[PDB]
Design a protein around this ligand. Structure first.
Ligand SMILES: Nc1ncnc2c1ncn2[C@@H]1O[C@H](CO)[C@@H](O)[C@H]1OP(=O)(O)S
Ligand SMILES: Nc1ncnc2c1ncn2[C@@H]1O[C@H](CO)[C@@H](O)[C@H]1OP(=O)(O)S
Length: 210
């Protein structure tokens, strides 16, 4: 017997649509924002970001914890065997979306995990450099879209990198206000919307088999 393609929290239909629509609305508002139009060089050396991020998750959205590749990924077997993983497998959770972000590569939503959910976050030998100085689980994210020649994986890195840019920042940096939060320009095509009111989505922790 083998492992899943990856473990994660898969949003209900109701919450997928709610978060997915939140994403589009952000893409549509950002692409029309003046600050964004001024930095368009990083997307086209106006633009509809909805089209730019044409590769979206087709069905339900999800928050990946541990990519296992059926055991072919390092740390995979070590993660699945954990008690908390077995005990949580199938259980429902509420994920907190604190921000939406975009880069030239990906678009997605930052997830802020509860202590219980942090127990479900892997602890591998191999770490992305961008996870430096950042608390565990920071990479927690929901992918909303990717550029044509970009892999979804990149979304987690794009989040981490963004968190580096704001590491030691304040809300006085905000470019301006969007209807649901403050907009930040972290340079180099990186934009983040920090939600005034955090979004909450029901999801189930389980294993996906591609
Ligand atoms: N190397 C990886 N690390 C973490 N998640 C990964 C990795 N590779 C793929 N994924 C994720 O698994 C899905 C199917 O491949 C992809 O859509 C990625 O999911 P997301 O967490 O949505 S970026
Ligand atoms: N209006 C601009 N167009 C192109 N590059 C710009 C512009 N303004 C600042 N730069 C910067 O000049 C360098 C060469 O492009 C790069 O450092 C550009 O900055 P960024 O990579 O966009 S942070």
């Amino acid at each position: 017997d083998f492992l899943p393609l990856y473990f994660g929290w898969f949003l209900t239909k109701k919450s997928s649509e709610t978060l997915r629509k939140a994403g589009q609305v952000f893409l549509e508002e950002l692409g029309n924002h003046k600050a964004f139009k001024k930095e368009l060089r990083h997307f086209i050396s106006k633009l509809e970001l909805v089209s730019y991020f044409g590769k979206r998750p087709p069905g339900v959205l999800h928050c990946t914890t541990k990519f296992c590749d059926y055991g072919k990924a390092a740390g995979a077997e070590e993660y699945a065997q954990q008690e908390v993983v077995k005990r949580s497998y199938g259980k429902a959770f509420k994920l907190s979306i604190s921000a939406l972000f975009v880069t030239p590569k990906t678009a997605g939503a930052q997830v802020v995990l509860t202590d219980q959910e942090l127990q479900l976050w892997p602890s591998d030998l191999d770490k992305p450099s961008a996870s430096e100085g950042l608390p565990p689980g920071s990479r927690a994210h929901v992918t909303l879209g990717c550029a044509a020649d970009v892999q979804p994986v990149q979304t987690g890195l794009d989040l981490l990198d963004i968190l580096q840019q704001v590491k030691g920042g304040s809300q006085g940096e905000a470019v301006g206000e969007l209807p649901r939060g403050k907009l930040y320009s972290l340079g180099k095509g990186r934009w983040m919307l920090s939600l005034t009111k955090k979004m909450e989505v029901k999801a189930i922790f389980t294993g996906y088999y591609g």
